[PDB]
C-alpha cells in the first residue's frame, strides 16, 4: 500500500448565532465515504459513496452518536480556547482536527496520527510514539497536562491500532471493486498559439485515481519544470482527479518536447508528444 482511513473535522464558533457549526468528513485513501454537518436538518452521519451504504442501521446510529458527541465536545473546546487566550466574545474562531491510520505490510497500524489546529496554528498533536503530546503554546500545555494525567494518548493509540485499522480493512473489502483498482488517466496534448515567440503545449491527465500523479515536460530529454506551469490536482466531480502541465515552446519546436505521465494505474510511464 499503504491504504489509509482518515477523518477531517472543522468546528467554527458562531457567537452571532449563539452556537457553533461542526463538519466532519471521512476518507478511505482519496475517496470520501461519509460526512456530517451539524447544520443539516436532522444531523446524522450520511453515506457519500455507494459501497458504505451496505452498513447496517446500528453503524449509522453509532457513527451519528459519536460525531454528535464530537461536535458538542468541540463546541465546548471553542469556548475554553476563547478563555485560554482571552479573545473577543464576538469573534468567530476555528478548530480543526485531523486523524487517521495507514495499513501496514502485515495488516497492522502504520503511522497513525492525530493533530489539532486553532485558527490555523498548531495546537496539540499526538507524537510518533503514540504515547506523548506536543503542545505548541501556553494554552496547549494546559490541555497537554490534563491529557497526560488522564492518559488520553492511550485512547487515541488503541483506536488507531485497533478499531481504525480494523474498519479500514473492512472498508477496503466493501469497496474493493472501486478502492483497490487504480484508474489510469486519459491523456491529451493540446496546442494553443500565443504571440510571435509564443506557442503553448498543454499535457492533460483526466479521470484518474488515486490522486497521486507525476506530470513532467522534457526537451530532447531535458526537464522543463522550471519553465512549465503545473496546476494543482483537482477533483473531476465523479470521484476521480485531473491535472495538467503546460509550457511555451519556440515557434517550430513542438516535436522536441515530450510530456511524461506516471501513475499507478499505468503499466509503464507514458511518453506523450503533440501528435
Amino acid at each position: 500500500g499503504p491504504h489509509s482511513l482518515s477523518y477531517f473535522s472543522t468546528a467554527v464558533s458562531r457567537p452571532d448565532r449563539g452556537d457553533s457549526r461542526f463538519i466532519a468528513v471521512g476518507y478511505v485513501d482519496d475517496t470520501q465515504f461519509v460526512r456530517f454537518d451539524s447544520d443539516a436538518p436532522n444531523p446524522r452521519m450520511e453515506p457519500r459513496v455507494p459501497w458504505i451504504q451496505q452498513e447496517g442501521q446500528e453503524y449509522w446510529a453509532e457513527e451519528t452518536r459519536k460525531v454528535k458527541d464530537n461536535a458538542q465536545t468541540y463546541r465546548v473546546n471553542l469556548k475554553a480556547l476563547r478563555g485560554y487566550y482571552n479573545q473577543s466574545v464576538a469573534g468567530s474562531h476555528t478548530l480543526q482536527s485531523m486523524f487517521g491510520c495507514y495499513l501496514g505490510p502485515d495488516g497492522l497500524l502504520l503511522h497513525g496520527y492525530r493533530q489539532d489546529a486553532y485558527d490555523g496554528a498548531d495546537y496539540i498533536a499526538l507524537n510518533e510514539d503514540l504515547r506523548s503530546w506536543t503542545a505548541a503554546d501556553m494554552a496547549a500545555q494546559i490541555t497537554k497536562r490534563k491529557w497526560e494525567a488522564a492518559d488520553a494518548a492511550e485512547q487515541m493509540r488503541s483506536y488507531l491500532q485497533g478499531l481504525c485499522v480494523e474498519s479500514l480493512r473492512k472498508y477496503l473489502e466493501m469497496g474493493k471493486d472501486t478502492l483497490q483498482r487504480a484508474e489510469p488517466p486519459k491523456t491529451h496534448v493540446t496546442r494553443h498559439p500565443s504571440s510571435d515567440l509564443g506557442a503553448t503545449l498543454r499535457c492533460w491527465a483526466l479521470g484518474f485515481y488515486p490522486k497521486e500523479i507525476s506530470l513532467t515536460w522534457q526537451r530532447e530529454g531535458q526537464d522543463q519544470s522550471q519553465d512549465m506551469e503545473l496546476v494543482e490536482t483537482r477533483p473531476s466531480g465523479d470521484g476521480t482527479f485531473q491535472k495538467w502541465a503546460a509550457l511555451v515552446v519556440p515557434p517550430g519546436e513542438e516535436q522536441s518536447y515530450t510530456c511524461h505521465v506516471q501513475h499507478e494505474g499505468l503499466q509503464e510511464p507514458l511518453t506523450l508528444r503533440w501528435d
Binding site: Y7, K66, N77, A80, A150, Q155, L163, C164, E166
Partner: peptide
Amino acid sequence: TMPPGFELY
C-alpha cells in the same frame, strides 16, 4: 469508524 470519545481541552 470514528473513535469512541473525544477529550475536553
